[PDB]
Design a protein around this ligand. Structure first.
Ligand SMILES: OC[C@H]1O[C@H](O[C@H]2[C@H](O)[C@@H](O)[C@@H](O[C@H]3[C@H](O)[C@@H](O)[C@@H](O[C@H]4[C@H](O)[C@@H](O)[C@@H](O)O[C@@H]4CO)O[C@@H]3CO)O[C@@H]2CO)[C@H](O)[C@@H](O)[C@@H]1O
Ligand SMILES: [Ca+2]
Ligand SMILES: [Ca+2]
Ligand SMILES: [Ca+2]
Length: 545
């Protein structure tokens, strides 16, 4: 329940704050900015992986689950971070990455050392077929999902990068070691987990070839490992052996789950997580099809209400482009950032703010593939360029869809590197930091940052915005996304002009009192309540008694 009322903030530590001048964010950097997060009103901090890692996938390739990444500091630094977070009235959830390890993890170093050894079946090994890979599956990061090991003459599976071999969840030995490791972290007093790639742990037994109608070199392989039948047996055991023993919050990153199939994931009785990140609204690749977005988010609002589930509300993370670009407008950056904020944040669920979302940070356009880092897009570039795609064609995909857009340094001020670092940042700062930065937004009462501050405040002050039932209004309006939250004798009306144009809208009205809780445009003195004349990306929230 505390997690129902929480507002969460997601830190990408490599890009949050560099405290010692090597261009890489670190834990002491996070500590130095906890005032910022406390003042914002954040309740829960989710920090991306901070464990020992070769950083082939920036922390998601872990070589020691119980040791801190050298780039980020030491276990003392972590203990200090957790102690400071907890003394400032906040909680911290860690990133739990147990679909795969680094290929430099001691388990894998042993697993690959000999065809027979005690760790061989900790991972997924198979001999080739027809002198090629065991099957035609493609890695999510492009290329084959199998990597050949010359020494033992077999392939190992990697859904993600070649340096992220998948763990074998069919091996009871593996599961036992993972549960011990999870509880070791929970025994330290962390407040839960965001659970990485968790819908990928069940592979179709025997790893059969997938249909290949377009005769590709490798076949996108989601039907072989994403949310496959049999996964719930493993997730139920994970919950029983770890999470259920502690008063924590869990949010599973669960691609491949739909609003109709969310029951076993988040239902109040028997769900294996408190909430999940679902992906149905994040793949609508021009004028946004607003009504399609209404349909998806409404499906999840209504769907989880019926099974007493809880939604995780978000538009940004370290795997997506920036939401102004994805859902708003760079022609109305500040206005659409605030409009999007009210839109997603005030639905029923637990809202997550990704670092820089509260500033209206936007996508970046670097010309050189060497300026980027994302293993997925570097791989994509190589494979597609050999296939004849031009540099411009590939950079368009990277610019418009690549997750590096969300990994540029946090923009603190207008000093060198936006104040993120005294050194040369591991990823270049967006040049628009001269216009978009924390320092400037603190002093502007109409900044995106202070709009998020107000959103957090009104959600905390009005129970209807936490527990109120959601209802979509004006479904057929292709520009206005409007909805209500209803609880006892209070109704909140959220009105978002999700368009770059002025629009008219009849107030969807039965009240003894009306109060405007938040608005991103000055109120027009002559304007009547009944006939809204909304500016581009104007949002208003009314509270009705
Ligand atoms: O630790 C390895 C990585 O794991 C985590 O991210 C993973 C997800 O768990 C995977 O499910 C997957 O998600 C991708 C997906 O591959 C890609 O197709 C795209 O998904 C679209 C989807 O196709 C579309 O139908 C709609 O639902 O929108 C989706 C989102 O746009 O994007 C997904 C998210 O990137 O791969 C990712 C890694 O890319 C972890 O968080 C990663 O940081 C980590 O590398
Ligand atoms: Ca550093
Ligand atoms: Ca089994
Ligand atoms: Ca007006």
């Amino acid at each position: 329940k505390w997690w129902k009322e929480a507002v969460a903030y997601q830190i990408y530590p490599r890009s949050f704050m560099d405290s010692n001048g090597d261009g890489i964010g670190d834990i002491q950097g996070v500590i130095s900015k906890l005032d910022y997060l406390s003042d914002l009103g954040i309740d829960v901090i989710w920090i991306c992986p901070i464990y020992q890692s070769p950083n082939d996938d920036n922390g998601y390739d872990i070589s020691d689950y119980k040791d801190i990444m050298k780039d980020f500091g030491t276990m003392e630094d972590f203990d200090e971070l957790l102690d400071e977070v907890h003394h400032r009235g906040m909680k911290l959830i860690m990133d739990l990455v147990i679909n795969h390890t680094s290929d430099e993890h001691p388990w894998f170093l042993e697993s690959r050392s000999a065809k027979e050894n005690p760790y061989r079946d900790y991972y997924i090994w198979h001999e080739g077929k027809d002198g090629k890979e065991p099957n035609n599956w493609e890695s999510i990061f492009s290329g084959s999902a199998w990597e050949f090991d010359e020494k033992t003459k077999e392939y190992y599976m990697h859904v993600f990068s070649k340096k992220q071999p998948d763990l074998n969840w069919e091996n009871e030995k593996v599961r036992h070691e993972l549960y011990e490791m999870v509880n070791w972290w929970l025994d330290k007093g962390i407040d839960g987990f965001r659970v990485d790639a968790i819908s990928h742990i069940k592979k179709v037994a025997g790893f059969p070839d997938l249909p290949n109608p377009e005769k590709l070199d490798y076949v996108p392989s989601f039907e072989g490992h994403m949310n496959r039948p049999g996964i719930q047996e493993h997730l139920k055991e994970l919950k029983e052996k770890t999470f259920a023993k502690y008063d924590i919050m869990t949010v599973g990153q669960a691609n491949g789950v739909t609003s109709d199939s969310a029951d076993e994931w988040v239902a109040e009785d028997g769900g294996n997580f408190n909430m999940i990140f679902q992906f149905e609204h994040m793949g609508l690749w021009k004028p946004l099809d607003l009504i399609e977005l209404k349909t998806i988010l409404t499906n999840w609002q209504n769907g989880l209400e019926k099974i007493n589930g809880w939604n995780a509300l978000y538009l940004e993370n370290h795997d997506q482009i920036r939401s102004v670009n994805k859902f708003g407008s760079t022609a109305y950056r500040v206005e659409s950032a605030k409009c999007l904020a009210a839109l997603y944040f005030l639905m029923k669920g637990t809202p997550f703010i990704y670092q820089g979302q509260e500033l209206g940070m936007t996508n970046v356009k670097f010309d050189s593939i060497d300026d980027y880092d994302d293993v997925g897009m570097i791989n994509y570039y190589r494979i597609q360029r050999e296939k004849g795609d031009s540099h411009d064609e590939i950079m368009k995909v990277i610019w418009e869809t690549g997750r590096d857009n969300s990994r540029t340094p946090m923009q603190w001020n207008t000093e060198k590197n936006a104040g993120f670092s005294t050194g040369n940042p591991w990823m270049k700062v967006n040049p628009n930091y001269v216009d978009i930065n924390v320092e400037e937004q603190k002093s502007d009462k109409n900044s995106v940052l202070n709009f998020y501050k107000q959103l957090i405040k009104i959600r905390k002050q009005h129970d209807v915005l936490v527990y109120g039932t959601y209802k979509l209004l004006a479904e057929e309006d292709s520009a206005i996304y409007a909805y209500t939250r209803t609880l006892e004798g209070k109704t909140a009306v959220v009105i978002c002009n999700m368009s770059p144009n002025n629009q008219t809208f009849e107030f969807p009205s039965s009240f003894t009192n009306i109060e405007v809780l938040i608005h991103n445009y000055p109120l027009d003195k002559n304007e009547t309540l009944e006939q809204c004349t909304l500016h581009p990306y104007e949002t208003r929230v009314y509270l009705i008694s």
